[PDB]
């Protein structure tokens, strides 16, 4: 383990890799976005740019597909999503290396999660805040990447939560070019899979059962070529639920969800859950201070292999 | 200019010809290095009148002329094509290309030079049977 | 092991039949090769897929990359590649 | 650069460079055209190919512009002009490296001179031989090089001669890009300048006086910025005549021919004359095997600078 200081003056909220795995973007509550590049020679993380982004705390950022250029989304609590494009004709560590493209002033609530759709669906976005409204923003005009149009507006929650009650939201797209467009949307205690229908509008497709408490993280496993998809969920309970999905009104394919496993090893709240490139190693963080690594056995049962204390 | 062309000094000839106050020195057809393309998905000609008109109006309103740098022929305004990709690295390509001739595929200078010189590979890096060697 | 699955499947899957699973494995391996920045190996995989798709008659069956250049002629003002 | 020996078995009649000054082509009387390229290494001439072209002695040659490809036109005594194009596919010095394009078999007498027009006229070929008529061939479509159409046919002589063997017809184009088209004809002993009028047909522009014997060569001078243009003519007597041509804007411009010099330092017959690219340094051939360089002095006349003789 080699710890490197990101340099923020407050709590680092979200860290995301790029597609090539050599750039990391860190957002924080100090109203800053920092992009770190992995040097090939020194093999140490070094800062590329650090610029003020929002007027409130940034909680979710995402890299775009590398075939659409280098675009970083940024969803903060000031009801804005800002899209940032790199112009390489600027000096590093200056604040002008990443140029602003567009502000999405349509969300009436503090945004929690932002996600890009896979590259075969176009340059799409997915926003979710405490207003309970799922918004999809496309990029229709190819001449300028500043005219982003809202296309799908689906309501996840009937009424927004009060300010004193906590809430958490998370999103996960479907990394499958050979399956129709799917979207895993995590409400307060609900997990909904949304599928693109024949009419061009999203519809409710399946619901993941369980989840007696707040869902803290959702993650769709990469389809390496298997016939069943995997969704990993980390709840406010100690459960790392892994859902096995088999795909076969106005929907191109009906899909069935069966719970594959349920692990209580963390003894707390599973804050984050993630997947590998091939869907073989899961990583789960919890209140025990330990990050557990899960791999499937021969009998399709996930068993912990390493525990990393901190 | 013809004397400069007789020697192997072509960049000097280009520098002389670019800022010549006489507008009809070599040829009268106007643009003879201009290349027009049809789209790879719809087949219409890439002239991009709508994008050029909108960017000219925007640059007239905002004053600065850097907005007109967004204009290009790497996108189609009729079929809404996003970008043209490199044949080796599959990245967006905007400013300089290196076209492989018999199959018609794009390429960065570094990517195409890497594949055709560093790797010593004689085939097109996009799955093409026609051996466009060297 | 989608890498070995694809590199075995390209030895006669589109040459003799057509199933969606082989194309899924091929696209997944190509995306992984892009993610590891192995563009040269992706290109070698593409030219191997083109070379191993030669039928008994000689007709190629691989879904090759389509053309990106359609030069317009200066004189006739039409497409040079029709 | 050092002198080199060709493989020709007879007399070389015309040697003409390419545009870029690295390809040389020699036509000879033993029915062979040998093309040599200047190698970058050690600065020596090396052979490209050698192919038989015609059935008689070839007396004229002229490269085309490199923008239209490596085209060589040869004129011989067989009343035909053949165009030849290089092929990089075939191996060097194999003999198949060059290919015919079109045979200009539209002559009754043996053709003497073939010359390529300036590039702003397109691909245009000038032919003049024993028939006493100047033939202009145009490429109306320069896309295909095997198509050639005769466009201008002007009778430069009043009558066909009797002693057809004792004749020499020479041509020289005018490299002025923005002047109207000017072509030089030396038919038997009279030198005629031809200008293109508003009707689209050639007309007699001006006549060079003098020329008491057969004009064996003619060469126009590239006027880089001068208000006057120069013509070098070579006669059978050994006299090199440099004419001064002033052009002032039925033709749209009149030409005033004024004789500027007449030198007889060649004790023989001046076969060929030439200009360098500045239009200043003039070189002349002769029957004595001597090469004389002529440069303009402080006055308006010309004087000899060196006499390059061969031993
Ligand atoms: Zn198009
Ligand atoms: Zn590239
Ligand atoms: Zn290709
Ligand atoms: Zn054409």
From Swiss-Prot, chain B:
Localization in the cell: Vacuole membrane
Zinc finger (RING-type): 86-128
Disruption phenotype: Leads to short telomeres.
The WD repeat ranges on this chain: 9-48
General remark: Present with 606 molecules/cell in log phase SD medium.
Function: Component of the SEA complex which coats the vacuolar membrane and is involved in intracellular trafficking, autophagy, response to nitrogen starvation, and amino acid biogenesis. May be involved in a process influencing telomere capping.
Family: Belongs to the WD repeat RTC1 family.
Subunit details: Component of the SEA complex composed of at least IML1/SEA1, RTC1/SEA2, MTC5/SEA3, NPR2, NPR3, SEA4, SEC13 and SEH1. Interacts with ribosomes.
Name of the molecule in the record: Restriction of telomere capping protein 1
Organism of this sequence: Saccharomyces cerevisiae (strain ATCC 204508 / S288c) (Baker's yeast)
Gene: RTC1
Portion held of the full protein: 1208 to 1341 of 1341
Curated annotation (Swiss-Prot), chain C:
Annotated family: Belongs to the WD repeat mio family.
Miscellaneous note of the record: Present with 184 molecules/cell in log phase SD medium.
Biological role: Component of the SEA complex which coats the vacuolar membrane and is involved in intracellular trafficking, autophagy, response to nitrogen starvation, and amino acid biogenesis.
Source organism of the structure: Saccharomyces cerevisiae (strain ATCC 204508 / S288c) (Baker's yeast)
Subunit structure, interactors included: Component of the SEA complex composed of at least IML1/SEA1, RTC1/SEA2, MTC5/SEA3, NPR2, NPR3, SEA4, SEC13 and SEH1.
Subcellular location(s) per record: Cytoplasm; Vacuole membrane
Protein name: SEH-associated protein 4
From Swiss-Prot, chain D:
Keyword Acyltransferase: no
Gene Ontology terms: cellular component: nuclear envelope; nuclear membrane; nuclear pore; nuclear pore outer ring; Seh1-associated complex; vacuolar membrane
Membrane topology annotation: Peripheral membrane protein
Pfam family for this entry, one: WD40
Gene Ontology molecular-function annotations: structural constituent of nuclear pore
WD repeat placement: 7-46, 53-94, 106-147, 153-192, 210-249, 265-304
Annotated compartments: Nucleus, Nuclear pore complex; Nucleus membrane; Vacuole membrane
GO terms for biological process, alphabetical: cellular response to amino acid starvation; mRNA transport; nucleocytoplasmic transport; positive regulation of TORC1 signaling; protein transport; regulation of TORC1 signaling
Keywords, alphabetical: Membrane, mRNA transport, Nuclear pore complex, Nucleus, Phosphoprotein, Protein transport, Repeat, Translocation, Transport, Vacuole, WD repeat
Annotated PROSITE patterns: WD_REPEATS_2, WD_REPEATS_REGION
UniProt-listed SMART domains: WD40
Subunit structure and binding partners: Component of the nuclear pore complex (NPC). NPC constitutes the exclusive means of nucleocytoplasmic transport. NPCs allow the passive diffusion of ions and small molecules and the active, nuclear transport receptor-mediated bidirectional transport of macromolecules such as proteins, RNAs, ribonucleoparticles (RNPs), and ribosomal subunits across the nuclear envelope. Due to its 8-fold rotational symmetry, all subunits are present with 8 copies or multiples thereof.
Family that this chain belongs to: Belongs to the WD repeat SEC13 family.
General remark: Present with 952 molecules/cell in log phase SD medium.
Name of this chain's protein: Nucleoporin SEH1
Species of origin: Saccharomyces cerevisiae (strain ATCC 204508 / S288c)
Gene symbol of the encoding locus: SEH1
